Symmetry: D2
Subunit: 339 residues, 4 copies
């Protein structure tokens, strides 16, 4: 009314859930009133306070009965394995951040939406072709607030999208192939063992190998940039850094370009979500950043052979914090326009 604060719940207080909670501390229009995971409050409070890659929490965390206090404010913790059994409404939760990795579909996410549950769900991952998929500052205008389940896309999509959109808007994209050189994640095995999803490569020791893997980010780009539907494909190489990633795109364009023209087009597209740098940085320099995507002008190529051009553009992203920053921008916007 005079000071609206929408109540949010987090399902899955993992890497994305905990970092989203950290960022929400500085968002006036939303607050987290309930966390659901599979463990006790002491474990969750400890993992919020201490973070290997993202540093100590900015404030105080104190375990209480049934939850924990953050800077004095109590947050309820439950441990319900089934979303239909989470009584989100008890804590006034209107929007659930679905961050477990197990309910990333329209049908699975709407298990949160019932009389004693929530009203809307933001999936912290691709959610299928039938949910609106949003990269903040690339296509968040597709939201009208009436949606029940939306997707924040993947980390790679949030990196690739502003870069591919800038190529499309300035030069026109014919086709392209992407490789993301990506930090290992919690879905890879720490040492060689049976991967629950049957992936023979994620079965391998993730901090000791270059591990090829599939990704849908390029194949599904049309959900975010319709004019690029079907034009991009890609894959990943997972490598031994615990967070921090980079996306390379090799494309053919509808117009001839120079390296200088490509770089200038990216700089002109820079905003809170898409950064620009000319410094020769490495992955540790992007851990914790707030851009969804950080274009690196030092890696651009335009190769001309017999009058034909291949164009290579490269952008950094902290698959943790870059994605989380985008997710929280989208949540904040969605909450404000919600209906």
């Amino acid at each position: 009314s005079v000071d609206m604060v929408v109540k949010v719940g987090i399902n899955g207080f993992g890497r994305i859930g905990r970092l989203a909670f950290r960022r929400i501390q500085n968002v006036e229009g939303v607050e987290v009133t309930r966390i659901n995971d599979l463990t006790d409050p002491n474990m969750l409070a400890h993992l919020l306070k201490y973070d290997t890659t993202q540093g100590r929490f900015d404030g105080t965390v104190e375990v209480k009965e049934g939850g924990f206090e953050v800077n004095g404010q109590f947050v309820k913790v439950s441990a319900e394995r089934e979303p239909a059994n989470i009584d989100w409404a008890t804590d006034g939760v209107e929007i659930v951040l679905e961050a477990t990795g197990f309910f990333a579909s329209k049908e699975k996410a709407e298990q949160h939406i019932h009389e004693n549950g929530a009203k809307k769900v933001v999936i912290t991952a691709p959610g299928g072709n039938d949910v609106k998929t949003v990269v903040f500052n690339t296509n968040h205008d597709i939201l009208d607030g009436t949606e029940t389940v939306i997707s924040g896309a993947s980390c790679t999509t949030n990196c690739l999208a502003p870069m591919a959109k800038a190529l499309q808007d300035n030069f026109g994209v014919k086709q392209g192939l992407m490789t993301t050189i990506h930090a290992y994640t919690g879905d890879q095995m720490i040492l060689d063992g049976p991967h629950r999803g049957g992936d023979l490569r994620r079965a391998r020791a993730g901090a000791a190998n270059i591990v090829p893997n599939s990704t849908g980010a390029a194949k599904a780009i049309g959900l975010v940039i319709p004019e690029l539907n079907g034009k991009l494909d890609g894959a990943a190489q997972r490598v031994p850094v615990p967070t921090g990633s980079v996306t390379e795109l090799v494309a053919t364009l509808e117009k001839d370009v120079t390296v200088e023209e490509v770089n200038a087009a990216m700089k002109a597209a820079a905003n809170d979500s898409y950064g620009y740098t000319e410094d020769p940085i490495v992955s540790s320099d992007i851990v914790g950043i707030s851009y969804g995507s950080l274009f690196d002008a030092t890696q651009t190529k335009v190769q001309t052979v017999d009058g034909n051009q291949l164009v290579k553009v490269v952008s950094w992203y902290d698959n943790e914090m870059s994605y989380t920053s985008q997710l929280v921008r989208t949540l904040e916007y969605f909450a404000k326009i919600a209906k």
Copy 2:
């Protein structure tokens, strides 16, 4: 003559035991039981991040694997009562799932169609003898049904502690194992199912303190040392390969040279001796249960009192596996 082994559980220990058994003449694996898709299991047997490519060929066939041109049965039974080990001539089972680590549970393999004996790859409880081969396998009389092969750290610590005890007498001591990360640590910070706030942390990106039971339970293997040793671990970012340091008080005054000589005199197939200044990668894949490193010995004398430091390397994977395979063969043969 050949000892025919069945392996229940095809994780790290089961797979490496299978690999090691291929190089030990007169021991063979004739059945594997594990709940995982055999296509995943075959791939994990073929390719190993730390232990290298499989020495030979592995193909999935209906009913099991073809390994080096020979069929090996692979089943997926949840209940040991339903594994007809005896069909494949299995006399002894390596119980390496973690789910049957007691006398009563492991004896489920001993049935009308089952095995005769079981070795658990974990502490086994009060009615289960704990054996470190070449330190106390003489305790076996062959009438046992279920025994334990102890833990990887116990197999490293035991011959070193036994040599100190036999030569000089141990009063007390504290152990620290600087230990590779393992599968029970999280790859990245996240809720640990066992409730351990330190195993919850990214295991390949941190020095992680943790508890260990090897020193406090050493009396099961060396009864003279009951209650005399305590210990802890620091888990660090190598994917296999570990080192145990022991600081002890002794009943006799000693010199560094006398300590090193006692260790060399105790060397055997299970307890190696080196004077080369090696590092952890140099012990990946070794078949000693413990490799004493004379370059790290200290004897500190202050005001007539001595603290003694002895250090042994172990591949927490292959050193322990090699010890289990020695114990499997010996236990099966005593009948």
Copy 3:
């Protein structure tokens, strides 16, 4: 008045000391010497794999760089005797190269066109006063020409050992530090210039035993413990962050609770206390020289005899540097 400082060796310790000096009113850096160019040094100050992006502005200039609006000269002279520190008014040099850590080598900075005093960022031998801030900085009178800030491990071990000695009396002890790899280890197996067959090995892929003098030389810092402590190191694959374990015999019987309480009572800006079950990444960037961890304490009693184990964390980079800069600030203020 503000004392002008020079840094020889703009390495891990040199750059982090520079970063901390930005927040110290009593000293300022007016000259850096290394073996490279300003572009390289400015880039390495800006971007730091383990300690994060620089807090402020950095711009390359001719002959140096501008940090937070202030130019600092950068030179490339490999021999200390040839560094004209006096041209930039430098009075005290931080000797942080790793190559000049003795009184005779460090005093080459002190001459008519050089500096007046040197702080070696490392053990510097038995003939230089060796200071762990908040354990023995009172030994300084300001007239010294060369002093040592000791090692990272000494700064971790000293307040912990001193608390045991003050409360209970130490008979003897052995220390192991489980320590991050450093720039002196090889990235991949190859000839180590110092001849160390273990530092020759790939440092981010091995547990690497190594000698350390931190315990054996504790008597330079805590004279009553001279000769009572010895130790060694295991270098392991983290790029910074370390932990020191000490196993000791004491002059009186203790409990775990009494040991932990004595450490808590000794806590100050240099010696922290925690009861949280932390891991090494949690101490990267801290400003304590030593962070005692009560969760790791043991007191083992067997047949009436006790072995006591106490454990303290340290960021071998930022913990040491925070101590070094406290010592430099104090030394500069009392300097004669």
Copy 4:
């Protein structure tokens, strides 16, 4: 030209490549190393030969003796001369020198090994200039006629890329392409952030703690090995935290339409002792220590068709240490035998 018909090899520089070449030669019929020259203390070198973090313990025994090593019961002289002109290679029967120091990677510098009491032929373990033929064994070793004095064995990445690019060219024709190698860290990167002597602001960074972009010369120089591809390929690298083992991705346009199945079949048909083929979904640790110069991975192939136009992606693994060493040792033996 030894009476006993054994190819006698000298190694200048006992770094990673020199030590692994020595190791490989122990199992090569009719080839032996009879002299090693390196400035380092032989006790350090012997220890590094015995114990190897990524390539395992030496197969046999190594002992220091006066003037050299005894390796598996055989003496090998080890000297420490700074100048090739002062290495009397001929005294140890050495016909061919593996020049692996990085300090003599040109025709006139490497020819300092060829003198009155020196060697007859030199193989440089690096790009070597352009009065120096560049040889990837089993791709273009047919360019040697035996009259050459100094040749180059190219680089590790070139030995990976060459058979893969050659198979595309021979079967389909290459218009242009871009390569990225996701590559193990190497000894020229810093273990922790610090000044890089070569001036590379990215190699200055902690190599086992970062994804590190870097330039590479293999694609731009491919014309030295495959002349018809001169000017057609460019590339770059991402160095990542594994201590050995690398992978090369190539995205190319071709002169005719292809399918994934046709591309993979063409690679399988091109397989030989230097270029392997796999359909197993392996990871980098699985290729450590292999003897192929390049191992094509059919699981990673893409052929993307959009509005009738195709981009083709092909990927090959290599142990940037042992794959390259294996190729160098093949080239050493072959060059020595045609030189006679």
